[PDB]
């Protein structure tokens, strides 16, 4: 009598994030 | 920050990681040896063997 087993499993997983937030006012008739 | 002239500014950081392992193994094994040996001299020409 033989018997063998063998289980393989892997995960992944990966997550990025990125932001970019910038605001421009000038005001010295003139406006920005 | 905003004061005479105005100076915006923005950044964001995010990173996410996951890893994973997963192993198994199994065995099994079985060995079973039976042997019979029979020797007669009863003096039968049929009955010993029988």
Redesign the interface.
Same mark, same amino acid.
């Given at each position: 009598?033989? @018997? *063998?087993? $063998?289980? #393989?499993? *892997? *995960? @992944?997983? #990966?997550?990025?994030?990125?932001? $970019? $937030?910038?605001?421009? #006012?000038?005001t010295p008739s003139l406006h920005g | 920050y905003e004061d005479k002239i105005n100076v915006g500014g923005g950044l964001s950081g995010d990173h996410c990681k996951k890893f994973g392992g997963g192993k198994t193994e199994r065995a099994r094994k079985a060995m079973a040896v039976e042997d019979i040996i029979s020797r007669v001299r009863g003096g039968s020409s049929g009955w010993s063997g029988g």
């Open positions: 009598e033989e @018997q *063998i087993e $063998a289980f #393989k499993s *892997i *995960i @992944q997983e #990966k997550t990025s994030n990125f932001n $970019a $937030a910038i605001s421009l #006012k000038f | -």
